[PDB]
Amino acid sequence: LPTAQEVQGLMARFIELVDVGDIEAIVQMYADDATVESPFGQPPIHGREQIAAHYRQWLKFRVSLTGPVRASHNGSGAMPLRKEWGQPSALDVILVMRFDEHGRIQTEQRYWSEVNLSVR
């Protein structure tokens, strides 16, 4: 499993990739059978093709870290971020990721809902 420093690096890079919107690079950071859990109790997204399709649908956007990555010794980490984007809207999110032996995202948990949305 990646160390804590490696997890920090990985999750930072993930943010960069989402910010530029490089879908292929994003998808490759995920394990081939990765699972992305939904904060809405919808079915999880499973596997690179579904993850790709969802990132393609999902992607006019700015994503940034609002604070340091919190890395662990168990190959996982959590980070706070803000997504910004007709009005000036923001969404506050926390992402939790568990990585496999190859430094790829094995599982992802996403924390946010409408209460974290600000339309201003």
Q: CATH number for the domain including 23?
A: 3.10.450.50
8 A C-beta contact, residue 39 and residue 112: yes
**Which residues touch 1 (CB under 8 Å, ≥6 apart)?**
74, 75, 99, 100, 101
Maximum Cα–Cα distance for the chain, whole Å?
43
For residue 36, give Cα distances in angstroms to 60, 66, 89, 105: 23, 22, 24, 9
User: What is the span of the domain harbouring residue 104?
Assistant: 1-120
Single-letter code of the amino acid located at 62 = R
Q: Which of 80, 58, 74 is nearest to 106 (CA)?
A: 74
Name the domain count of the chain: 1
Backbone angles phi, psi at 13, to 5 degrees: -60, -40
By CB atoms closer than 10 A (0-12, 13-18, 19+), residue 77 is: buried
Structure determination technique employed: X-ray
Measured between alpha carbons, how far is residue 41 from residues 44, 78, 109, 110, 113 in Å? 8, 20, 12, 11, 11
